[PDB]
Amino acid sequence: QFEERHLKFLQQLGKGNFGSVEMCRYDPLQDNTGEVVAVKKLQHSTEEHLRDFEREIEILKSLQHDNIVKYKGVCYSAGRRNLKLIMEYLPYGSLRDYLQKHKERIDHIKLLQYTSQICKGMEYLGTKRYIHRDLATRNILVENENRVKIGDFGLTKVLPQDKEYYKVKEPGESPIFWYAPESLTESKFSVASDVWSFGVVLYELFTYIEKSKSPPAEFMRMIGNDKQGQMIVFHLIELLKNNGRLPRPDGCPDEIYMIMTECWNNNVNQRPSFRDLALRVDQIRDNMA
Numbered sequence: 001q002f003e004e005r006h007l008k009f010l011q012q013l014g015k016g017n018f019g020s021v022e023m024c025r026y027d028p029l030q031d032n033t034g035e036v037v038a039v040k041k042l043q044h045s046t047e048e049h050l051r052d053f054e055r056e057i058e059i060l061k062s063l064q065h066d067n068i069v070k071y072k073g074v075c076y077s078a079g080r081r082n083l084k085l086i087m088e089y090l091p092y093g094s095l096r097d098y099l100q101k102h103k104e105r106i107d108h109i110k111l112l113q114y115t116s117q118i119c120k121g122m123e124y125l126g127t128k129r130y131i132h133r134d135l136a137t138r139n140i141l142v143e144n145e146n147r148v149k150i151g152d153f154g155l156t157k158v159l160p161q162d163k164e165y166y167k168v169k170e171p172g173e174s175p176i177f178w179y180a181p182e183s184l185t186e187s188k189f190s191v192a193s194d195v196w197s198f199g200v201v202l203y204e205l206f207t208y209i210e211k212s213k214s215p216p217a218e219f220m221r222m223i224g225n226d227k228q229g230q231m232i233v234f235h236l237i238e239l240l241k242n243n244g245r246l247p248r249p250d251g252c253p254d255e256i257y258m259i260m261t262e263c264w265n266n267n268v269n270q271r272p273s274f275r276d277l278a279l280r281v282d283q284i285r286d287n288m289a
């Protein structure tokens with residue numbers, strides 16, 4: 001129950017898919033003692049986007065986990081237009097930028113620490129029957145050198161009880177190079193498609209976000225930068241159906257790549273669970289230490 005005349009804009013932190021996040025100071029006493037918080041707002045506040053935003057707020061507020069960004073509250077302007085979501089501010093930004101920043105002091109054990117935390121966050125999501133749908137290092141935030149948190153839930157959906165997937169297609173851009181094949185062909189999203197995307201996240205981490213090694217660059221080279229608009233996705237589909245896959249990143253051990261390729265199974269039922277992913281990653285971590 002923060003109200004916007006005490007929210008002082010400091011800078012933009014991110015621009016999402018119909019929303020953006022600002023770094024602000026909440027200073028109700030107006031003496032510069034208040035906390036720095038993150039404030040998410042819609043950029044073009046239609047009725048559909050606002051109903052989606054309210055569902056997103058309910059989801060985040062229902063999550064309490066060390067590797068999920070903390071909900072703090074909501075902000076309203078006269079009436080209830082201009083809805084704003086108040087969250088904890090995490091000072092090291094997104095894991096994509098952090099990792100690109102500190103390439104030279106983040107070793108493989110540190111990557112596997114982040115990996116384990118992401119899987120525990122995702123397993124908690126699954127226990128709530130939430131499907132994230134936008135798992136990527138740009139949507140993971142760094143609280144400190146030893147803790148990351150899943151940081152955005154704009155595309156997250158609740159499963160119907162009678163079903164284990166959720167069919168949804170949205171207008172606009174979709175992170176198709178993180179999408180499982182059944183999400184590309186049938187718009188089916190499930191815990192298993194989140195596992196596919198987590199494999200892509202793991203690939204990202206072990207590339208250290210090298211520009212020419214991004215999933216989009218690699219896939220566009222594999223189908224050819226000659227492709228064009230939606231013909232593009234069509235070719236992606238066929239490449240994935242013939243087991244075309246992102247390569248093992250430089251310096252990636254063979255067992256970490258084995259985890260990646262196991263998450264990238266065409267057979268939706270043969271992808272590992274998040275509990276098993278965490279177990280294997282933790283055993284590799286223990287071996288390295």
Ligand SMILES: N#CC[C@H](C1CCCC1)n1cc(-c2ncnc3[nH]ccc23)cn1
Nearest residue numbers: 013014015016021038089090139151152
């Ligand atoms: N995660 C993620 C991606 C997200 C952008 C994507 C969706 C709108 C903004 N983003 C969140 C932040 C951010 N930075 C620092 N503290 C935060 N708290 C909550 C979000 C947040 C920066 N970019």
